[PDB]
Design a protein around this nucleic acid. Structure first.
Ligand SMILES: [Mg+2]
Ligand SMILES: [Mg+2]
Ligand SMILES: [Mg+2]
Ligand SMILES: [Mg+2]
Ligand SMILES: [Mg+2]
Ligand SMILES: [Mg+2]
Ligand SMILES: [Mg+2]
Ligand SMILES: [Mg+2]
Ligand SMILES: [Mg+2]
Ligand SMILES: [Mg+2]
Ligand SMILES: [Mg+2]
Ligand SMILES: [Mg+2]
Ligand SMILES: [Mg+2]
Ligand SMILES: [Mg+2]
Ligand SMILES: [Mg+2]
Ligand SMILES: [Mg+2]
Ligand SMILES: [Mg+2]
Ligand SMILES: [Mg+2]
Ligand SMILES: [Mg+2]
Ligand SMILES: [Mg+2]
Ligand SMILES: [Mg+2]
Ligand SMILES: [Mg+2]
Ligand SMILES: [Mg+2]
Ligand SMILES: [Mg+2]
Ligand SMILES: [Mg+2]
Ligand SMILES: [Mg+2]
Ligand SMILES: [Mg+2]
Ligand SMILES: [Mg+2]
Ligand SMILES: [Mg+2]
Ligand SMILES: [Mg+2]
Ligand SMILES: [Mg+2]
Ligand SMILES: [Mg+2]
Ligand SMILES: [Mg+2]
Ligand SMILES: [Mg+2]
Ligand SMILES: [Mg+2]
Ligand SMILES: [Mg+2]
Ligand SMILES: [Mg+2]
Ligand SMILES: [Mg+2]
Ligand SMILES: [Mg+2]
Ligand SMILES: [Mg+2]
Ligand SMILES: [Mg+2]
Ligand SMILES: [Mg+2]
Lengths: 394, 63, 131
RNA sequence: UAUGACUCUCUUAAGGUAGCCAAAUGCCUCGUCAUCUAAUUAGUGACGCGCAUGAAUGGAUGAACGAGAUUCCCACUGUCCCUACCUACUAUCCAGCGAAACCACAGCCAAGGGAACGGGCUUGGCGGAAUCAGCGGGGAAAGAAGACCCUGUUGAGCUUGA
RNA sequence: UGUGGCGGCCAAGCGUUCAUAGCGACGUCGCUUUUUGAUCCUUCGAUGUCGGCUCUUCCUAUCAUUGUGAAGCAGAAUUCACCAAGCGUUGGAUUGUUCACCCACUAAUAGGGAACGUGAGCUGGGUUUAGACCGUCGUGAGACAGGUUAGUUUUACCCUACUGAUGAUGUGUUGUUGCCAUGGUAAUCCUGCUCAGUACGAGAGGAACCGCAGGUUCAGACAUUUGGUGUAUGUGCUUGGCUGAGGAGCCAAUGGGGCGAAGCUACCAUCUGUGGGAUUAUGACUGAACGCCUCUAAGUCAGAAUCCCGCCCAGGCGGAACGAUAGCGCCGGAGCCUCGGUUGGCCUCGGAUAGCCGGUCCCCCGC
RNA sequence: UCUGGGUCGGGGUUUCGUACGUAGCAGAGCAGCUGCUGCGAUCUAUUGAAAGUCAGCCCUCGACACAAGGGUUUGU
């Protein structure tokens, strides 16, 4: 017979293979559509999740109750050191799809990027690209390289560039860099290639890729939770207390005459470590990294136009389970996917953004830097010392 | 923006922290954390609790 | 113009709140919440400013054994405002109000939440304290 | 208006008296009224026309008592909204030791036909070693020569006007 | 398919007039197996026999929502009908209930199937053993789809299916960065402001499009804040006992109780959730058939919660580019095994069919 | 890459709430001496003290030794 009362389905069948992700780095499944009218730019970047904090900001939206009132909003900090471009890959459009055509790497490749090509850097003789790097210093290799770039100009329609992260500017344990193809979007293929050719062996910061108050997408792997039951995995109803064969179960997994178990039935398995793409996160702030000038360092990242302080984005005691953020960072509104110290892919939006929420202008009034390692109650150590006074240890 | 002072301890309450307690006879209080909140709702004197600002001001500690 | 932001609702069906006015009613048993579409095995529940249907359990006998409309003015459950402030009250309190929005009684004993006062002007007129 | 003390008639050994009741007993029935609720096929109090109540086949009542049956209220709580977290022993893996149930052959489906619900047949969809932890849709899964129903010119326990 | 349910044809009449806006007698034709029958084909060396809870999918005979046609459609509200199953269809009192009835919310509280879905998923309220009580029947043992009460719910470690987890084929070995063939697929609805007390209407009343602010249901996350947990057994407090006492500690199956880091976690906190194409219903254009007319016959336009693709999820006994390649690679006579099939090659216009093909350029434009 | 992690120590953060001892003409009082000396829960100062703090917190460039290794396979 029919179901007695109607109820919506638990879970989504659109994220259906809830398995462990085959990749650790988030992957751009679709880049933004290229048009020749726009100038030549990058469409993606790669950051590392540090932590979250507060913003007190001034809201400009006409018609709301919260118009010209201060709000408190959660933000996520992703540390984004500048990336190094080490090669260009071309693509051709085939009736079977989009076949890669030719890859040309740079002459000098750092040990960060060379670590990626090995499972054991300690036992390796570090021989990667050693016979390849003798192609940039002889005439018979340079002519071949120019013919390879000319063939890519003649035959390629999609140009992607190879860039890797800089792991020695991070407080992480890993030294092995992350490589990624970024689709170069701009004018013709010829000037698109003659842009990446000069940016070979060069550093691209996050300011060349993203602007202030841009609505971007975050691609990354969910934090893993292991083999979970159906009550945690699919959020089904808990069976009552009198249930004999366990209560954290789905009671009926199917009818009789469809004598299989359906693929839409909620069943136990791996929860977490799923590759997700969350769209429409606003960039509240592109911070500036630590830099030494005239002997002393400029670390006042979390200072706003209203705060006028000398504090960094790092809270008291540092970010919990991450480290210290000493490079450029991107402040995204709300939470992003994944755990801390996780590599995330920041992608430009696939959509045209014609909305007052998407086009709202953000000014920061206050960034909270109290300790996240407990209930912190002091913004800075100088404020803490000025409130507490002298202790016994002095 | 206006920062508050804790009704039990006396510490500065930054805008994202703490809670507010509005009693039936008015008298809205604000609390830094659940420790000071439970100390207020258990009817305890801040002048007898060592880490509060009022105890330091009464016993003339610091300076 | 401006519309109500959602809050931490914590007063389901069956909740007995107290009646903070001079109608002679003492309690208000919440039998349902207006504006609730529903969900399978999910009780209708309300926060401050939500119109509910209530029933007087003790008080004057001419208010008992019938359904009244009411507006919740105070809740004990902590709710977050957009200013990042978590607020809660000492008790759960409501007043008896007709279907249009005018109050049945005259005066209010105790404060009235800002989320209720900004939506109901005839309760904010008789309110002694705000938030 | 109705009900109807009263009368007449038919009748059997009398024709149910005092009580009591939609009861553990009332088919109709979720009877009617009142109360309890916002809402009650439940509960309680009345009404008695009682299919089929009733006086040691005992009637009515009733303090104390009850691991007896039922209704409501206070207080209390994860019973629930709506789930979450922690601990111990398992389950997991390893060293050693190590069974049993079950088993025509075996095991991916849709439809057709067919002993009228196929794993095998027909037509299609298709199919790729060996495995691990779970799981309860299917094997019309296992246990037990159906206790229900019928037959047997098969029985037993019990009763009586056989 | 009698009965139940649903749908037609004819049209006497109802509808102030008026058969057919909406209905429809007397007749008559059908559909369905969500009703009960009728039958006895399968099952009695056993297919677990009612509900409820839980969970997934399907149907349309569409309650609401999208797009529309018709009214006895002025507006508002409401009826009839089409494409249409994408998304929803609730919280409760009573009863074991299915059903029913009432309260309240809502946008609507539509109907059903899957062995009358679902007992090695639960429960055991009912039914349906043995104990008892009442009423009726029987001389009696006992009987009662008549009430009442108490009454053991076993096994998966096998195969498949499903959920996840290793790996396998073969590209000489391995590594990096990628493509997507195929499967899955998701967002949905409502309120307030303005429009506007405006159109419309004698009046009472009373819209809609574009915008703005939010919310419901769902989905995916996440822990800065609030809450929960807490054996960091972290730090105080405390009962009984014990180490002669202080100090420091221990035991009481976590002794008990405050506060509590990290981690995990809650619409109990927070963030995010999208674009095209062909088109359906329908309304049309041009225009015959049929000198007129006609959305249709040829041709053409607009067109949507549907469909398909995008976005997103997985990544083929499926490819690609590139790096490094240890006794191995690249180039220039002998034979030995094994697997086999074959017995000259066509090195190319685009295409039309009620039309083609090749020259010629003395013409006119250009690449 | 005279460098790398690890351990220890230190600093930062944070949790609880003011450690032991000493001193006090603080202490309801009581007792023994003729004001003193003892018993005394608790209080005050030292003392936001003491204790814990990555095992999955953050910086150290402070001490200590270790890390230039072992085994099994793979060919166009
Ligand atoms: Mg349904
Ligand atoms: Mg049980
Ligand atoms: Mg924290
Ligand atoms: Mg329910
Ligand atoms: Mg009598
Ligand atoms: Mg009841
Ligand atoms: Mg009675
Ligand atoms: Mg009798
Ligand atoms: Mg009797
Ligand atoms: Mg073993
Ligand atoms: Mg078989
Ligand atoms: Mg065969
Ligand atoms: Mg099974
Ligand atoms: Mg069986
Ligand atoms: Mg037999
Ligand atoms: Mg015979
Ligand atoms: Mg016999
Ligand atoms: Mg015998
Ligand atoms: Mg005889
Ligand atoms: Mg019929
Ligand atoms: Mg007529
Ligand atoms: Mg026959
Ligand atoms: Mg059988
Ligand atoms: Mg079976
Ligand atoms: Mg239809
Ligand atoms: Mg069944
Ligand atoms: Mg079953
Ligand atoms: Mg069972
Ligand atoms: Mg029973
Ligand atoms: Mg019995
Ligand atoms: Mg096992
Ligand atoms: Mg597809
Ligand atoms: Mg007018
Ligand atoms: Mg927290
Ligand atoms: Mg807590
Ligand atoms: Mg916590
Ligand atoms: Mg001691
Ligand atoms: Mg013991
Ligand atoms: Mg606690
Ligand atoms: Mg047409
Ligand atoms: Mg068109
Ligand atoms: Mg279109």
């Amino acid at each position: 017979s029919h179901r007695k009362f109607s109820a919506p389905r638990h879970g989504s069948l659109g994220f259906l293979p809830r398995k462990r992700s085959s990749r650790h780095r988030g992957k751009v499944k679709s880049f933004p559509k290229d048009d020749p009218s726009k100038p030549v730019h990058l469409t993606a970047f790669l950051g590392y999740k540090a932590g979250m904090t507060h913003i007190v900001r001034e809201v400009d939206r006409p018609g709301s109750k919260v118009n010209k009132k201060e709000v408190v909003e959660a933000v996520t900090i992703v540390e984004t050191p500048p990336m190094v471009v080490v090669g260009i890959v071309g693509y051709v459009e085939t009736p079977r799809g989009l076949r890669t055509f030719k890859t040309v790497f740079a002459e000098h490749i750092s040990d960060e990027c060379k670590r990626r090509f090995y499972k054991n850097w300690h036992k390796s003789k570090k021989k990667a690209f050693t016979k390849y790097c003798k192609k940039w210093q002889d005439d018979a290799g340079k002519r071949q390289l120019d013919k390879d770039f000319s063939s890519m100009k003649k035959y390629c329609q999609v140009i992607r560039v190879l860039a890797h992260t800089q792991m020695r500017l991070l407080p992480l344990r890993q030294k092995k860099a992350h490589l990624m193809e970024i689709q170069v979007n701009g004018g013709t293929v010829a000037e698109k290639l003659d842009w990446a050719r000069e940016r070979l062996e060069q550093q691209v910061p996050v300011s060349q890729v993203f602007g202030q108050d841009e609505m971007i997408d975050v691609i990354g792997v969910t934090k893993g939770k292991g083999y979970k039951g159906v009550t945690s995995r699919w959020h089904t109803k808990k069976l009552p207390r009198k249930t004999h064969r366990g209560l954290r179960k789905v009671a009926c997994i199917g009818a009789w005459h469809p004598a299989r178990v359906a693929f839409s039935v909620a069943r136990a398995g791996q929860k977490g470590y799923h590759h997700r793409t969350e769209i429409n996160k606003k960039i509240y702030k592109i911070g500036q990294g630590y830099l030494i000038k005239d002997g002393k360092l400029i670390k006042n990242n979390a200072s706003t136009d209203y705060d006028l302080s000398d504090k960094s984005i790092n809270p008291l005691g540092g970010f919990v389970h991450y480290g210290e953020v000493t490079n450029d960072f991107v402040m995204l509104k709300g939470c992003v996917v994944g755990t801390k110290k996780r590599v995330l892919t920041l992608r430009k939006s696939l959509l045209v953004q014609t909305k007052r929420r998407a086009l709202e202008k953000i000014d920061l009034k206050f960034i909270d830097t109290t300790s996240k390692f407990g209930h912190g109650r002091f913004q800075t150590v100088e404020e803490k010392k000025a409130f507490m006074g002298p202790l016994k240890k002095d | 923006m206006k920062v508050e002072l804790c009704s039990f301890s006396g510490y500065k309450i930054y805008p994202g922290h703490g809670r507010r307690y509005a009693r039936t006879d008015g008298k809205v209080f604000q609390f830094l954390n659940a420790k000071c909140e439970s100390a207020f709702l258990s009817k305890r004197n801040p002048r007898q609790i060592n880490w509060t600002v009022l105890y330091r001001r009464k016993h003339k500690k610091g300076q | 113009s401006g519309a109500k932001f959602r809050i931490s609702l914590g007063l389901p069906v069956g909740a007995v709140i107290n009646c903070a006015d001079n109608t002679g009613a003492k309690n208000l048993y919440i039998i349902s919440v207006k504006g609730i579409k529903g969900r399978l095995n999910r009780l209708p529940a309300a926060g401050v400013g939500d119109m509910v249907m209530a029933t007087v359990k003790k008080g004057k006998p001419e208010l008992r054994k019938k359904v009244h409309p009411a507006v919740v003015i105070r809740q004990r459950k902590s709710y977050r405002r957009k200013d990042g402030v978590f607020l809660y009250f000492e008790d759960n309190a409501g007043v008896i109000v007709n279907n249009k929005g005018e109050m049945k009684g005259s005066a209010i004993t105790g404060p009235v939440a800002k989320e209720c006062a900004d939506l109901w002007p005839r309760i904010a007129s008789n309110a002694g304290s705000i938030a």
